[PDB]
Design a protein around this nucleic acid. Structure first.
Lengths: 148, 38, 94, 141
RNA sequence: AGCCAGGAUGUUGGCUUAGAAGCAGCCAUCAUUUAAAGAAAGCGUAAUAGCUCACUGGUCGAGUCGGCCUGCGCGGAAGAU
C-alpha cells in the first residue's frame, strides 16, 4: 500500500467510470484463474476498444468509495468480492448478456448477478439491450408483396 | 535433543515454549533443532 | 522549535543533584550575556527524547521557567558514563 | 476455451508433418496418434504458410481419435526473421550491439494479436518494446 | 496472525562442468507483463521436473509490533555417615 496519493487514483478511475458510464455487470472473482479474465478481455475488447474495464476492487474504501457520487446502491453489492464492470461509450450493448453467457460456463460466479444501477430494480437478467443499430430488417418484404 | 544453557531459535520453524518450568525449542521442520535448557 | 519546561533549583550541590537524578529529573544551567547564571532542573525523560534528534543541539530552544520564555542554545551535555542518560546540561543564552 | 486437458507444445515442421530425430514418436504416444498428424494438420497448412516452426497442441485423452489445434509464433523469435541478427546477441549481455527498426515493431505484433491482453491495438506494441529490448537492442526510432 | 489466490516473462542468464535448468560453484544481481512475482531464502533432483518461501490481492474487522529503562522471579546448578 502507498499512502493517500495512490489509493485515490483507483477511486478517481472508479468514480469516473461509475459516473461517466452506462449499464454495468458484476463478476464475483472469488478464485480468479488466468483464462477467466482473459476470456472477458476479448469480450470487453469487442465493445469499441478498452472502455469496459473490470478490476478486482471490492473494498469499501475502494470501489465503494465512489458510491456517494454516482451508483448510490453499491453498499449491498460491496461485501465479499464484486468486480463492477462499469461501461462507457454506447449503452448496455451485450455486456449483461455476454456476462450471463460467460458466467454460465462455470466462470467462478457473480453473487447471483447482483447488478449495477440503470433502471429501478436490482437483479434482473434482461435481453432487451442486444439490437441497437439494425436497420435492414424492414427491407426484406418489398419484392415479394407486389405480384399478389 | 540438545540440552544447553543457551537455547535459541535456529530457524524460521523453531518455536520457543516453556513447559513445566523448562525453556524448550520445538521445531516443526528439523528434528535436530529441538532443544531443552539444562 | 523545541520548548523545554524547567523549575528553579532551591538546593544545589552533590547530594541534591544525586537526589534529583534519582527522581527522574536532572540539573542544568543557563549562562550568557549580562544576566546572572540561572540553575534549573529538568524532567529527564522529556529532554532525552528531544536530544535524540540532532536538530536539538543546532537550533535555538526555549526554556520556560517561572512562566518566562528564555531562548537558549545547548552548549554542553554531561552524559552518564555507561547509560543512555543525562547528568547535566549547559545552555547558553541566545 | 474454458477447460484444458493435456498439451505438449514443440517447434515442429509445417512442410512435411513426419519428423523422427526432433519429435516423431515423442510428439504423441500417450493415447495420441502419429497417423492423424499427417491428414488433418496438413489440411489447414496449405492455406497459410509452411516451413517455419509451428507449435501444435493435440487434444487427446483416451478416445484414440483427437482434435488437432493451431497456435501462434514466438514474439521473441519475431526479431530474427523480421528485424536483423537471427541470434539476437552474439556476445555476453554487457555491450549493446543489436538493433531493430522504427518502421517495424508494430505490424509484426498485429499478426499475433490473438494472444495479447492489451485491449488497445497500440497497447500490445508497448509490450513488444520490452521483448525487443531483451538484451538491450537500441532501435533508431 | 491465520485463511483463499497468484508466486509469471527475456530465461534454462552465461560458463566450467560430467551435468548445472533460482539452488555445485564463479559472477552480473539486470530488465519485462505490472497488483506482485528474488537471474532467487529453504526443501527436492541425475538435472530438469516437483514442493514451499519472499513480496502482493482478497476475506476478516481491532488493536498490534519490538526496542529502551528499571522491580521481583526462572534455567545455567553434580559428592561422598
Amino acid at each position: 500500500m502507498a499512502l493517500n496519493l495512490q489509493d485515490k487514483q483507483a477511486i478517481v478511475a472508479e468514480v469516473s467510470e461509475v459516473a461517466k458510464g452506462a449499464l454495468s455487470a458484476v463478476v464475483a472473482d472469488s478464485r480468479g484463474v488466468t483464462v477467466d479474465k482473459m476470456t472477458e478481455l476479448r469480450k470487453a475488447g469487442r465493445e469499441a476498444g478498452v472502455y469496459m474495464r473490470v478490476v478486482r476492487n471490492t473494498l469499501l474504501r475502494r470501489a465503494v468509495e465512489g458510491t456517494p457520487f454516482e451508483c448510490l446502491k453499491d453498499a449491498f453489492v460491496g461485501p465479499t468480492l464484486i468486480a463492477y464492470s462499469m461501461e462507457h461509450p454506447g449503452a448496455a450493448a451485450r455486456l449483461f448478456k455476454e456476462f450471463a453467457k460467460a458466467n454460465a460456463k462455470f466462470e467462478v460466479k457473480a453473487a447471483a448477478f447482483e447488478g449495477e444501477l440503470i433502471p429501478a430494480s436490482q437483479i434482473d437478467r434482461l435481453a432487451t439491450l442486444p439490437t441497437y443499430e439494425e436497420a435492414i430488417a424492414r427491407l426484406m418484404a418489398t419484392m415479394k408483396e407486389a405480384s399478389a | 535433543m540438545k540440552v544447553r544453557a543457551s537455547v535459541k531459535k535456529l530457524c524460521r520453524n523453531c518455536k520457543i515454549v516453556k513447559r513445566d518450568g523448562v525453556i524448550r525449542v520445538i521445531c516443526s521442520a528439523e528434528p535436530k533443532h529441538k532443544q531443552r535448557q539444562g | 522549535m523545541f520548548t523545554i519546561n524547567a523549575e528553579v533549583r532551591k538546593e544545589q550541590g552533590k547530594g541534591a543533584s544525586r537526589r534529583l537524578r534519582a527522581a527522574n529529573k536532572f540539573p542544568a544551567i543557563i549562562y550568557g550575556g549580562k544576566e546572572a547564571p540561572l540553575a534549573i532542573e529538568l524532567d529527564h525523560d522529556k529532554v532525552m527524547n528531544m536530544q535524540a534528534k540532532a536538530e536539538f543541539y543546532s537550533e535555538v530552544l526555549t526554556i520556560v521557567v517561572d512562566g518566562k520564555e528564555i531562548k537558549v542554545k545547548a552548549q554542553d551535555v554531561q552524559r552518564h558514563p555507561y547509560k543512555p542518560k543525562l547528568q547535566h546540561i549547559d545552555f547558553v543564552r541566545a | 476455451a474454458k477447460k484444458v486437458q493435456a498439451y505438449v507444445k514443440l517447434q515442429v515442421a509445417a512442410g512435411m508433418a513426419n519428423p523422427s530425430p526432433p519429435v516423431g514418436p515423442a510428439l504423441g504416444q500417450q493415447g495420441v496418434n502419429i497417423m492423424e498428424f499427417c491428414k488433418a494438420f496438413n489440411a489447414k497448412t496449405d492455406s497459410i504458410e509452411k516451413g517455419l516452426p509451428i507449435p501444435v497442441v493435440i487434444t487427446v485423452y483416451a478416445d484414440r481419435s483427437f482434435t488437432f489445434v493451431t497456435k501462434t509464433p514466438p514474439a521473441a523469435v519475431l526479431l530474427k526473421k523480421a528485424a536483423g541478427i537471427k541470434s539476437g546477441s552474439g556476445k555476453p549481455n554487457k555491450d549493446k550491439v543489436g538493433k531493430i527498426s522504427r518502421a517495424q515493431l508494430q505490424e509484426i505484433a498485429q499478426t499475433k494479436a490473438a494472444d495479447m491482453t492489451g485491449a488497445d491495438i497500440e497497447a500490445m506494441t508497448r509490450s513488444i518494446e520490452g521483448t525487443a529490448r531483451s538484451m538491450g537492442l537500441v532501435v533508431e526510432d
